[PDB]
């Protein structure tokens, strides 16, 4: 997973950080920014689909009463008999990428064939254009940093 | 969904709240507490299983490349052909309840037969014992409030 911190250009956060530290030292309570147009933190996971595999259009949360999972692959195709469907989410499309969003956590799915010669920077930069545009914000007014977590 | 705010007994938060408001008025940045032993916010969804249905033991995140979902029920049993399994989560057990946790978001599943004459208060109070014990904290040292959201 990647942790992405974004910031509106020109905004200084030094007095914010000093006051957060002061509040922590007095109350013992650590305060963090609510995601806004000024500042935020998001989490991104990138999955590349193997050649000869289609990108997903829906994410399904299913539940099983079976008491073991030794018949279930993680990260492979299979058939699921007699499961309870709890949630269905339609993925957004941005170019060849499919994007699943849950609050500040994002998962992107890209076809092998499309990202064969692409690095993490190129992917993240495309994702961040999608992200800012999804919020109605101008991407040219932000910087962001990436951390592996 | 329910929003639950918990607080360590005896701790006063009035100066925290005043300083959060001051920081917001100066920086335009709203700060909220990181969940800790002193204070936090969690989200709970309660599902009751119908009579003649087993409680889940695992939650599966599956993806399908199918371009419509009109064959998928929400909140019913079905079979899923040719899906990609991305994640499997084992549910915890607390009495008759099964609990799925993702960071500060919880989903509990209870059998109809067990909660037939139970109200929201009774369920939430059981969940909160589970929650505090899961963190290694003493439930008798906390208060909490519930809000429908």
Give, as one character, the DSSP assignment of residue A113.
G
Residue ranges of B 19-48 with Cβ closer than 8 A to chain A: 19-20, 23, 26-34, 36, 38-39, 47
| CA atoms within 13 A of residue A41's CA, in its CB half-sphere | 9
Distance CA A54, CA A98 (A): 11
From chain A, pick out residues whose CB is under 8 angstroms from the CB of B74.
85-88
List C-alpha distances in Å: A57 to B67, B69, B80, B89: 6, 9, 14, 22
User: What SS3 string covers chain B?
Assistant: CEEEEEEECCCCCHHHHHHHHHHHHHHCCCEEECCCCCEEEEEEEEEEECCCCCCCCEEEEEEECCCCCCCCCCCEEEEEEEEEEEEEEECEEECCEEEEEECCEEEEEEEHHHCCCCCHHHHHHHHHHHHHHHHCCCHHHEEEEEEEC
List C-alpha distances in Å: A123 to A44, A64, A127: 11, 35, 6
CB B61 within 8 A of CB B87: yes
Q: Of A47, A58, A28, A64, give the one whose Cα is nearest residue A115.
A: A47
- In chain A, the DSSP E strands lie at 2-8, 31-33, 39-49, 58-64, 76-90, 92-94, 97-102, 105-111, 142-148
What does this entry list as its resolution, in Å?
Answer: 2.0
Q: Which of A27, A31, A57 sits opposite B64 (nearest CB)?
A: A57
Pairing of strands B97-102, A2-8: unpaired
Kind and range of the H or E run holding A133: helix A120-135
Buried/exposed code over A31-49 (b: 16+ C-beta within 10 A; e: otherwise): bebeeeebbbebebebbbb
Pairing of strands A39-49, A105-111: parallel
Contact B55 A77 (CB under 8 A): no
Q: Of A124, A133, A122, A88, give the one whose Cα is nearest residue A106.
A: A124
Whether residue B56 lies within 8 A of chain A, CB to CB, comes out as yes
Q: Tell me how the structure was determined.
A: X-ray
From chain B, pick out residues whose CB is under 8 angstroms from the CB of A33.
29-32
Give, as one character, the DSSP assignment of residue A23.
H
Distance CA A141, CA A19 (A): 25
Which residues have CB under 8 Å from B123's CB, separation 6+?
Answer: B46, B108, B110, B115
CB B11 within 8 A of CB B39: yes
Contact A60 B58 (CB under 8 A): no
From chain A, pick out residues whose CB is under 8 angstroms from the CB of B48.
none
List C-alpha distances in Å: A126 to A27, A45, A138, A140: 41, 14, 14, 13
Q: How far apart are the first and last CA of chain A?
A: 6
Q: Which of B19, B29, B73 sits opposite A36 (nearest CB)?
A: B29
Whether residue B5 lies within 8 A of chain A, CB to CB, comes out as no
- The first and second tokens of residue B115, run together, are 């909660």
Please check whether the domain covering A1-149 is classified as CATH 3.90.1000.10: yes
The C-alpha of A126 sits at a distance from chain B's nearest C-alpha, in angstroms, of: 22
Distance CA B120, CA B139 (A): 18
- The first and second tokens of residue B74, run together, are 């929400």
């Amino acid at each position: 997973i990647l942790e992405i911190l974004y910031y509106k250009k020109g905004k200084e956060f030094g007095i914010l950080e000093k006051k957060m530290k002061e509040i922590f030292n007095e109350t013992g309570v650590s305060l963090e920014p609510v995601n806004s147009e000024l500042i935020g933190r998001i989490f991104l996971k990138i999955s590349v689909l193997e050649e000869g595999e289609e990108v997903p259009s829906f994410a399904i949360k299913a539940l099983t009463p079976k008491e073991n999972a030794v018949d279930l692959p993680l990260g492979d195709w299979t058939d699921l008999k007699n499961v309870f469907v709890e949630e269905i989410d339609y993925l957004d499309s941005y170019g060849d990428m499919k994007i699943l969003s849950e609050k500040n956590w994002y998962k992107i799915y890209v076809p092998y064939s499309s990202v064969k010669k692409k690095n993490r920077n190129e992917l993240v930069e495309e994702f961040m254009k999608y992200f800012f545009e999804s919020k109605g914000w101008n991407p040219g007014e932000y910087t962001f940093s990436v951390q592996e977590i």
